[PDB]
Design a protein around this ligand. Structure first.
Ligand SMILES: O=C(Cc1c[nH]c2ccccc12)N/N=C/c1ccc([N+](=O)[O-])c(O)c1
Ligand SMILES: [Ca+2]
Ligand SMILES: [Ca+2]
Ligand SMILES: [Ca+2]
Ligand code: NA
Length: 187
């Protein structure tokens, strides 16, 4: 096995917690192990993954935000159970499940609201990750302008924070958000 096989009860458990079949779970564990022999992905390794996908801007900050959502137990490592569950929601979830995950990504302090400064932190990290290989349209060319449009559309009581309900409904109102979150294996 060389631990490239999971225990049977662990295969059954992870298949039951994800949109993957038993075979798919086993294939992902095999790749996870070749790429991370210790069975634990650290923040540095996560940033390397994002560094290859996005070699034009600095993805340090954004990969760290994502790393922290993958890291459901906050021990500073991604283990396979965490990895596979995060991949299942982000690649195969329903729109409501992806929106719940997205909310956890933006709710940096886990208090149930996304403030404007929280969203600005995430959106700045995204802008930095893409980097200015291309010029954006003027009305969305800073992270501030993007956050202001989002709060205009979604902050219904205009208190400077988004509840989970405001983010979900606000997200569903915008066709480009709906589109981005309704993919299954990217399609
Ligand atoms: O290791 C991975 C996944 C993954 C895909 N293909 C692989 C091959 C080898 C190892 C890992 C992978 N990080 N992406 C994570 C992720 C997190 C959040 C979002 N979001 O922000 O939407 C997303 O789209 C993907
Ligand atoms: Ca962990
Ligand atoms: Ca918060
Ligand atoms: Ca609000
Ligand atoms: Na499954």
């Amino acid at each position: 096995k060389s631990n490239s096989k999971l225990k049977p009860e662990v295969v059954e458990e992870l298949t039951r917690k994800t949109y993957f079949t038993e075979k798919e779970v086993q294939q992902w564990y095999k790749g996870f192990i070749k790429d991370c022999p210790s069975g634990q992905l650290d923040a540095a390794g996560f940033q390397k993954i994002y560094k290859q996908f996005f070699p034009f801007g600095d993805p340090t900050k954004f990969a760290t935000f994502v790393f922290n959502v993958f890291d459901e137990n906050k021990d500073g490592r991604i283990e396979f159970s965490e990895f596979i569950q995060a991949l299942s929601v982000t690649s195969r979830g329903t729109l409501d499940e992806k929106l719940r995950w997205a909310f956890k990504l933006y709710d940096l302090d886990n208090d149930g609201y996304i403030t404007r400064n929280e969203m600005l932190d995430i959106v700045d990290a995204i802008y930095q990750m893409v980097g200015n290989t291309v010029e954006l349209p003027e009305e969305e060319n800073t992270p501030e302008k993007r956050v202001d449009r989002i709060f205009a559309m979604m902050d219904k009581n205009a208190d400077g924070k988004l509840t989970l309900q405001e983010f979900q409904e606000g997200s569903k109102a915008d066709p480009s958000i709906v589109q981005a979150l309704s993919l299954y294996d990217g399609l």
